[PDB]
Every structure is written in C-alpha cells, then in structure tokens.
C-alpha cells in the first residue's frame, strides 16, 4: 500500500510510487528521476501513463523496456496541462534528468515536490519566484547540522589535480572510478579530460550513458578498454582485491592504480578539509573516498526552505523512525521562528 507522502491531495497523481501495484484512484504516475529506490516496480509490463523528463523517458524505454505509448516526457520550465491540472518540471540539480514538480491544484493550493535535490541559490530565480507555495514535499536526506560537505566544484578540483599529478609522475598509472547508478558523471569526465583520454566502460554502462543527452558524448566515452587510461567499474569492485584483479587483465600496460570512490557524506567530513584528504594504500594501489554529493547539505536545505517559506513541510526521506521524524520537525520549527513565517 502506497504511503501518504507519495500522494498528491486533490489529484489523481502519485510520485515515485511504482512498487505498490495499482494505486486506487491514480490516473497518472510521476517519476522524478531514474534511481532504483524511486522507479522500483516499473518494467515492460507497466500499462499506466508515466510523466517524467525527456532523459528519464530515454532510460525507461532503453533500459527498463517500458513501451513508448505509456511514456509521457515533458519539457522543463514550461506550464503543461496533465489530466486537467497545471504542472511544471524544474531542474533538481541531482542526477541527469532529475526534476522537481510544481502542481497548481484546482482549489488554488500550490504544491512543490522536490524529488531528490541539491538545493542551490539559482533555484531562487526559477519559476518558483513568482508565487506562493503552500505545501513542500522535501528531500530531507541530510537534514541535520552534522552534514557538511564541500561544493561539487571544490571536489572536482581535488580529483583533477590528484589524477593529473599521479599520471604525470607515472605515465604507466591507471585511473579507475567507481559507479552504481546514474549521477556524478562529472567525476570521471573531468579526470579523463585533463588526461586527454576517453573513458572506458562495459557495454551496459555505455548504453546508459548514451541515453543522457550529454553534449559531444561520442568524443568522451568508449567501450574499448585498451585505448583508454580512465576505466569505470562497478562500485563493489573498488577495493584492494577487485582492483588487483582488474590490473591483471590489462596485460602489463600499467603498474599502478589510482581509484576514486565518490560517496555521499562520511564522518571523516566532521574533522578533515577536502584539501587534507588522503587515500588508503596497499602496494601499488591507492583509493580516495571523495565526498561528491547530489543531495542538499543541511545549510543549503535550510537556506532554500527559509527562502520558500512553505506553510507545511512533508519529508520524503528518513521517515521510518520516531527519533528521525522528531529531529526533522524541531529543525523545521527553528527555521520558521528564525525567519518569521
Ligand atoms: Ni536519487
């Protein structure tokens, strides 16, 4: 059974609600982004209308084999009518194709559903600026003050400089980057670009990347591993055993691996600046965990919400425990009292 926080009152709409069977009364299923906790349940046998971005639509078609007749892609930043209700999709600054949805209810209520997002001040000049929002369905992944991490730009700067130094010192080093889903593509693309290489990967990952409308992509990625000095591997293979084994396969072309594991937040963030980050090393293998986040920090989240001044907030993450829910409600009240809405 579908939980309440995936239902849009006064509509026949649900958001990211594919794992509950047929939801009573749902005339259109919205999908915010192509990540497995959100699409869980979709397949080629799904026969209700799905509304989503162009990029999400490419992935539904090519990776999950959803039939074209049920895929309804919408352009961003454009007022659209769906089953008699005005909607707008906005960029969520999450992974490729990820959106927030603004719903304009027939009774005059306005609802913003953020999906998953990394709040940014640039959102304060989208179509959000033009009217009041009554209810906010909020990505609360990191809704606690301990969650600090650097900007995406600082993290990429660290990775580019790290990789460029290592390979200039040793032209026979291989760079490996972990992945398990879409998002965080800037990590491996930025590193390959500074090294003048394409990125090598499996046919399945290449297929996924070809759905994402990235400019000049044919110039940046390849399935030919042997022509490339930046390789992508599944995240589970980014450990001393998995990399040792991968190095065997490269046929004495390389004598050193430097590997990156983009994580979300980790507790080493409470003590250590990005500048100061060091790898785990064994032999000729080094592994850097870098805190590249596609979710709001606490401070970014707070700033967005205090700007928006919603009348009510409904969290969509960390909703399973009483202690979590109580913690989040206390922060929402502080924010409201401090800003005065
Ligand atoms: Ni996500």
């Amino acid at each position: 059974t579908c939980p309440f926080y995936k239902k849009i009152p006064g509509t026949g709409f649900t958001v990211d609600a594919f794992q509950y069977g047929v939801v009573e009364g749902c005339t259109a299923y919205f999908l915010t982004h192509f990540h497995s906790d959100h699409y869980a349940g979709l397949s080629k046998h799904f026969t209700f209308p799905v509304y989503c971005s162009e990029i999400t639509g490419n992935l539904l078609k090519n990776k999950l084999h959803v039939q074209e007749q049920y895929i309804h892609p919408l352009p961003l930043d454009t007022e659209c009518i769906v089953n008699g209700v005005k909607v707008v999709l906005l960029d969520a600054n999450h992974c490729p194709g990820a959106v927030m949805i603004l719903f304009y209810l027939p009774n005059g209520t306005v609802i913003l559903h953020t999906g998953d997002f990394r709040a940014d001040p640039s959102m304060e000049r989208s179509l959000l600026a033009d009217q009041k929002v009554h209810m906010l369905y909020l990505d609360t992944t990191y809704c606690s003050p301990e969650y600090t991490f650097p900007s995406q730009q600082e993290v990429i700067r660290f990775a580019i400089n790290t990789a460029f130094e290592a390979v200039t010192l040793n032209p026979h080093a291989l760079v490996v980057c972990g992945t398990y889903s879409i998002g965080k593509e800037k990590v491996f693309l930025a590193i390959a670009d500074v090294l003048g290489s394409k990125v090598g990967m499996s046919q399945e990952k290449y297929k996924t990347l070809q759905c994402l409308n990235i400019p000049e992509i044919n110039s940046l990625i390849t399935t030919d591993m042997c022509s490339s000095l930046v390789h992508l591997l599944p995240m589970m293979q980014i450990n001393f055993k998995g990399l040792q084994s991968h190095l065997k396969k490269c046929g004495g072309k390389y004598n050193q691996i430097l590997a990156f594991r983009p994580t979300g937040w980790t507790h080493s963030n409470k003590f250590t600046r990005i500048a100061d980050v060091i790898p785990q090393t064994k032999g000729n293998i080094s592994i850097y965990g870098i805190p590249y986040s596609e979710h709001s920090s606490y401070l970014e989240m707070k700033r967005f919400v205090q700007w928006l001044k919603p009348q009510k907030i409904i969290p969509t993450v960390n909703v399973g425990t009483w202690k979590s829910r109580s913690t989040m409600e206390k922060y929402f009240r502080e924010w409201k009292l401090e800003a005065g809405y």
Side-chain angles (χ1 to χ4, degrees), residues 71-203 205-215 217-240 242-247 249-251:
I71 308 182
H72 300 257
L74 309 174
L76 304 184
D77 303 317
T78 304
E79 295 188 324
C80 291
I81 309 303
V82 178
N83 299 358
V85 178
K86 179 158 75 165
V87 305
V88 171
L89 302 189
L90 303 163
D91 198 280
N93 189 42
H94 184 58
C95 62
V99 302
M100 313 191 291
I101 316 165
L102 258 189
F103 299 93
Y104 293 80
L105 268 46
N107 75 2
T109 306
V110 180
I111 295 171
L112 179 64
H113 195 304
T114 63
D116 281 348
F117 89 144
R118 189 165 183 174
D120 192 74
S122 69
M123 297 171 172
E124 304 168 17
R125 296 170 280 283
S126 60
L127 311 200
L128 283 180
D130 304 37
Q131 88 292 275
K132 186 194 168 48
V133 171
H134 301 78
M135 316 191 83
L136 181 67
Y137 288 67
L138 178 61
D139 172 12
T140 42
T141 302
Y142 297 129
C143 189
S144 189
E146 73 276 24
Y147 298 113
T148 62
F149 33 76
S151 73
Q152 287 178 171
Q153 196 277 327
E154 292 172 76
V155 177
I156 285 306
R157 176 92 286 195
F158 170 89
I160 280 169
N161 288 355
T162 299
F164 180 72
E165 164 164 326
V167 170
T168 302
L169 295 169
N170 181 193
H172 297 282
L174 171 65
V175 176
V176 177
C177 291
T179 185
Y180 41 34
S181 67
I182 63 164
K184 311 187 185 193
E185 286 83 9
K186 193 62 170 181
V187 179
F188 55 85
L189 302 172
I191 289 168
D193 170 86
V194 85
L195 300 175
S197 183
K198 295 197 176 177
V199 184
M201 58 192 74
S202 69
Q203 289 186 257
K205 186 73 185 184
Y206 180 97
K207 183 176 162 170
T208 302
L209 296 187
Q210 286 293 165
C211 303
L212 308 179
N213 297 350
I214 291 171
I217 199 55
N218 296 329
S219 67
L220 316 166
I221 62 172
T222 180
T223 54
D224 180 16
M225 298 296 276
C226 288
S227 76
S228 142
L229 67 142
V230 180
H231 295 182
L232 304 196
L233 288 184
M235 201 71 93
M236 288 187 67
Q237 189 162 6
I238 313 302
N239 45 69
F240 297 125
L243 298 162
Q244 269 165 216
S245 173
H246 182 72
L247 187 59
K249 295 155 209 151
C250 291

Side-chain angles (χ1 to χ4, degrees), residues 33 35 38 94-95 116 295:
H33 70 289
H35 276 166
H38 299 259
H94 184 58
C95 62
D116 281 348
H295 297 275

Side-chain angles (χ1 to χ4, degrees), residues 281 283-311 313-320:
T281 292
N284 62 344
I285 309 188
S286 283
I287 302 177
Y288 284 87
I290 59 174
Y292 192 94
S293 180
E294 286 184 346
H295 297 275
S296 307
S297 72
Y298 170 88
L299 290 172
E300 290 163 355
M301 190 188 305
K302 181 171 182 287
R303 179 195 165 113
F304 178 77
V305 175
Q306 288 184 312
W307 174 86
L308 195 69
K309 296 173 175 66
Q311 287 181 352
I313 304 180
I314 300 158
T316 65
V317 189
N318 303 310
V319 307

